[PDB]
Design a protein around this ligand. Structure first.
Ligand SMILES: [Zn+2]
Length: 36
């Protein structure tokens, strides 16, 4: 078979976060980047 649409286009590579805009995901991925 093949992968589904997962309800939203931009699903985070680390967590269950997802959004309808790539710039909004990019802002969420910056939180994962700065957290240490
Ligand atoms: Zn995330």
């Amino acid at each position: 078979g093949s992968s589904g649409s997962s309800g939203k286009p931009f699903k985070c590579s680390l967590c269950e976060y997802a959004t309808r805009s790539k710039s909004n995901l990019k802002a969420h991925m910056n939180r994962h980047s700065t957290e240490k």
